[PDB]
Enzyme design. Structure first.
Site, PDB file in Angstrom:
ATOM      1  N   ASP A 114     -18.580 -15.430 -50.188  1.00 35.46           N
ATOM      2  CA  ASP A 114     -17.473 -15.336 -49.271  1.00 35.46           C
ATOM      3  C   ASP A 114     -17.484 -14.040 -48.439  1.00 35.46           C
ATOM      4  O   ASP A 114     -16.737 -13.106 -48.664  1.00 35.46           O
ATOM      5  CB  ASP A 114     -16.139 -15.442 -50.025  1.00 35.46           C
ATOM      6  CG  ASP A 114     -14.979 -15.691 -49.100  1.00 35.46           C
ATOM      7  OD1 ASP A 114     -15.221 -16.017 -47.911  1.00 35.46           O
ATOM      8  OD2 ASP A 114     -13.796 -15.586 -49.530  1.00 35.46           O
ATOM      9  N   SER A 155      -6.815 -11.628 -47.244  1.00 38.86           N
ATOM     10  CA  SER A 155      -8.184 -12.148 -47.223  1.00 38.86           C
ATOM     11  C   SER A 155      -9.016 -11.440 -46.159  1.00 38.86           C
ATOM     12  O   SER A 155      -8.624 -11.236 -45.020  1.00 38.86           O
ATOM     13  CB  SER A 155      -8.234 -13.670 -46.881  1.00 38.86           C
ATOM     14  OG  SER A 155      -7.669 -14.468 -47.931  1.00 38.86           O
ATOM     15  N   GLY A 156     -10.208 -11.073 -46.582  1.00 41.07           N
ATOM     16  CA  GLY A 156     -11.135 -10.412 -45.711  1.00 41.07           C
ATOM     17  C   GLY A 156     -11.054  -8.890 -45.721  1.00 41.07           C
ATOM     18  O   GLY A 156     -11.958  -8.237 -45.217  1.00 41.07           O
ATOM     19  N   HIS A 180     -14.365 -17.330 -45.545  1.00 41.85           N
ATOM     20  CA  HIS A 180     -13.352 -18.406 -45.578  1.00 41.85           C
ATOM     21  C   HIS A 180     -12.283 -18.244 -44.505  1.00 41.85           C
ATOM     22  O   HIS A 180     -11.627 -19.226 -44.141  1.00 41.85           O
ATOM     23  CB  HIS A 180     -12.748 -18.506 -46.997  1.00 41.85           C
ATOM     24  CG  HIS A 180     -11.637 -17.559 -47.283  1.00 41.85           C
ATOM     25  ND1 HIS A 180     -11.793 -16.445 -48.055  1.00 41.85           N
ATOM     26  CD2 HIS A 180     -10.325 -17.625 -46.977  1.00 41.85           C
ATOM     27  CE1 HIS A 180     -10.642 -15.817 -48.155  1.00 41.85           C
ATOM     28  NE2 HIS A 180      -9.734 -16.535 -47.531  1.00 41.85           N
ATOM     29  N   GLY A 227      -2.989 -13.662 -47.219  1.00 39.78           N
ATOM     30  CA  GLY A 227      -3.029 -12.996 -45.946  1.00 39.78           C
ATOM     31  C   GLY A 227      -3.780 -11.617 -45.914  1.00 39.78           C
ATOM     32  O   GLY A 227      -4.014 -11.080 -44.838  1.00 39.78           O
TER      33      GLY A 227
HETATM   34  C1  LIG Z   1     -13.088 -18.642 -50.734  1.00 39.91           C
HETATM   35  C2  LIG Z   1     -11.577 -18.648 -50.529  1.00 39.91           C
HETATM   36  O1  LIG Z   1     -10.980 -19.540 -51.523  1.00 39.91           O
HETATM   37  C3  LIG Z   1      -9.616 -19.446 -51.727  1.00 39.91           C
HETATM   38  C4  LIG Z   1      -8.759 -18.633 -50.984  1.00 39.91           C
HETATM   39  C5  LIG Z   1      -7.396 -18.621 -51.291  1.00 39.91           C
HETATM   40  C6  LIG Z   1      -6.464 -17.768 -50.437  1.00 39.91           C
HETATM   41  N1  LIG Z   1      -6.873 -16.328 -50.455  1.00 39.91           N
HETATM   42  C7  LIG Z   1      -6.574 -15.539 -51.541  1.00 39.91           C
HETATM   43  C8  LIG Z   1      -7.189 -14.253 -51.611  1.00 39.91           C
HETATM   44  C9  LIG Z   1      -6.920 -13.411 -52.634  1.00 39.91           C
HETATM   45  C10 LIG Z   1      -6.014 -13.817 -53.686  1.00 39.91           C
HETATM   46  C11 LIG Z   1      -5.729 -12.989 -54.764  1.00 39.91           C
HETATM   47  N2  LIG Z   1      -6.254 -11.724 -54.928  1.00 39.91           N
HETATM   48  N3  LIG Z   1      -4.851 -13.368 -55.706  1.00 39.91           N
HETATM   49  C12 LIG Z   1      -4.305 -14.580 -55.651  1.00 39.91           C
HETATM   50  C13 LIG Z   1      -4.549 -15.485 -54.643  1.00 39.91           C
HETATM   51  C14 LIG Z   1      -5.421 -15.107 -53.584  1.00 39.91           C
HETATM   52  C15 LIG Z   1      -5.696 -15.970 -52.538  1.00 39.91           C
HETATM   53  C16 LIG Z   1      -6.620 -18.308 -49.046  1.00 39.91           C
HETATM   54  O2  LIG Z   1      -7.282 -17.716 -48.211  1.00 39.91           O
HETATM   55  N4  LIG Z   1      -6.024 -19.454 -48.678  1.00 39.91           N
HETATM   56  C17 LIG Z   1      -5.125 -20.282 -49.559  1.00 39.91           C
HETATM   57  C18 LIG Z   1      -4.402 -21.245 -48.569  1.00 39.91           C
HETATM   58  C19 LIG Z   1      -5.251 -21.258 -47.266  1.00 39.91           C
HETATM   59  C20 LIG Z   1      -6.170 -20.004 -47.320  1.00 39.91           C
HETATM   60  C21 LIG Z   1      -7.605 -20.491 -47.139  1.00 39.91           C
HETATM   61  C22 LIG Z   1      -8.389 -20.812 -48.276  1.00 39.91           C
HETATM   62  C23 LIG Z   1      -9.705 -21.266 -48.117  1.00 39.91           C
HETATM   63  C24 LIG Z   1     -10.225 -21.393 -46.812  1.00 39.91           C
HETATM   64  C25 LIG Z   1      -9.487 -21.077 -45.682  1.00 39.91           C
HETATM   65  C26 LIG Z   1      -8.149 -20.598 -45.824  1.00 39.91           C
HETATM   66  C27 LIG Z   1      -6.872 -19.401 -52.356  1.00 39.91           C
HETATM   67  C28 LIG Z   1      -7.738 -20.208 -53.110  1.00 39.91           C
HETATM   68  C29 LIG Z   1      -9.102 -20.246 -52.801  1.00 39.91           C
HETATM   69  O3  LIG Z   1     -10.025 -21.002 -53.516  1.00 39.91           O
HETATM   70  C30 LIG Z   1      -9.561 -21.903 -54.549  1.00 39.91           C
HETATM   71  C31 LIG Z   1     -10.648 -22.936 -54.802  1.00 39.91           C
HETATM   72  C32 LIG Z   1      -9.328 -21.022 -55.774  1.00 39.91           C
END
Ligand SMILES: CCOc1cc([C@@H](Nc2ccc3c(N)nccc3c2)C(=O)N2CCC[C@@H]2c2ccccc2)ccc1OC(C)C
Ligand SMILES: [Ca+2]
Ligand SMILES: [Cl-]
Ligand SMILES: [Cl-]
Ligand SMILES: [Cl-]
Lengths: 58, 250
Positions: free
Chosen positions: B90, B188-189, B41, B186
């Site tokens: 992912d 992520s990954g 993602h 932030g």
């Molecule tokens: C597969 C990733 O899916 C999602 C990813 C995310 C977020 N990443 C994370 C990772 C770990 C988290 C954790 N350990 N605790 C709490 C929240 C966390 C958030 C993210 O990367 N986002 C949100 C804003 C932009 C950017 C994005 C998101 C997706 C794509 C590109 C950039 C939030 C919702 C997603 O799916 C929904 C449907 C729940």
């Protein structure tokens, strides 16, 4: 010994063989000791070890 | 990372920082001198695939100390089953343009065998998650690399203890439902790293969740054990022109 219980006694990877047989193996950068279970590094920077901590105990 | 601590410099030597036009994008995990594992993602909005940089040996984003090593990202490989803007599958495998040099500050995390990971690592309760993500929900990101110890849940328990996408067999929950401690967007990954008898292994990828450290919700991680043979096959393959590659999964 079977790999599903206690990792077959292996430090790292474990394969079941036909019989009451098991073989342990090690990741690249390690070799298996004569105990058949333990893995020791063969290179300076083996995976999954933290150099500043391995020297803090060397 | 919410509710952790600074990873002392050199103690997270597999951590990767991914940049696009100099701006922080995502974390990742070094698994060999040319290969990095991250989240699919992270790449959903990339315009110019040719300004992606991976940095190894990073610690404090405010300074250059000479232990950092920067490489261009030559290939981003994503499973065919991943659908942009959704959660399942992912994972991304990144090929660097030139190997990093292993040093005290730059070391790969072991990619475990599938059986070992399923039969043994999956039952180790606590594992470390790290990154330069937000220190608080709706807060600033970290300047120093942060690390957090989180406990893993069986998915049935995660569903019962939680109160939205399915948690699939390509995922697992870890962390806390009280809002104190989590990875966040932030991060992520980045790695979910699991210790077993003196060695650390890659078990998960920071993937998704609700908000950030939100009461009633755990972090969701990609279950890397599902992808071991997929990754190993790709690591034996020749590079292909064009940065993005979609590869069949399984
Ligand atoms: C597969 C990733 O899916 C999602 C990813 C995310 C977020 N990443 C994370 C990772 C770990 C988290 C954790 N350990 N605790 C709490 C929240 C966390 C958030 C993210 O990367 N986002 C949100 C804003 C932009 C950017 C994005 C998101 C997706 C794509 C590109 C950039 C939030 C919702 C997603 O799916 C929904 C449907 C729940
Ligand atoms: Ca620095
Ligand atoms: Cl040696
Ligand atoms: Cl090939
Ligand atoms: Cl391209």
């Amino acid at each position: 010994l079977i790999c599903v219980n206690e990792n077959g006694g292996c430090e790292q990877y474990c394969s079941d063989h036909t019989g009451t047989k098991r073989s342990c193996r090690c990741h690249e950068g390690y070799s298996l000791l004569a105990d058949g279970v333990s893995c020791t590094p063969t290179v300076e920077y083996p995976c999954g070890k933290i150099p500043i901590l391995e020297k803090r105990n060397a | 990372i919410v509710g952790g601590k600074v990873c002392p410099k050199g103690e997270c030597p597999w951590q990767v920082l991914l940049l696009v036009n100099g701006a922080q994008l995502c974390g990742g995990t070094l698994i060999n001198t040319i290969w990095v594992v991250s989240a699919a993602h992270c790449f959903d909005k990339i315009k110019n695939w040719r300004n992606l940089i991976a940095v190894l040996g990073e610690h404090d984003l405010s300074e250059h100390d000479g232990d950092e090593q920067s490489r261009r990202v030559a290939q981003v490989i994503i499973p065919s089953t991943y659908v942009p803007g959704t959660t399942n599958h992912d994972i991304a495998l990144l090929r660097l343009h030139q190997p990093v040099v292993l040093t005290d500050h730059v070391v790969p995390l072991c990619l475990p065998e599938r059986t070992f990971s399923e039969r043994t690592l999956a039952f180790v309760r606590f594992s470390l998650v790290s990154g330069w993500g937000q220190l608080l929900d709706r807060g600033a990101t970290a300047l120093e690399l942060m690390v957090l110890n989180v406990p893993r849940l069986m998915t049935q328990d995660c569903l019962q203890q939680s109160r939205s996408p399915n948690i699939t067999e390509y995922m697992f929950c870890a962390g806390y439902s009280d809002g104190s401690k989590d990875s966040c967007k932030g991060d992520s990954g980045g790695p979910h790293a699991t210790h077993y008898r003196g060695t650390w292994y890659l078990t998960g990828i920071v993937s998704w969740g609700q908000g950030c450290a939100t009461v009633g919700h755990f972090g969701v991680y990609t279950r890397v054990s599902q992808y071991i043979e997929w990754l190993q096959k790709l690591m034996r393959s020749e590079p292909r022109p064009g940065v993005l590659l979609r590869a069949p999964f399984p």
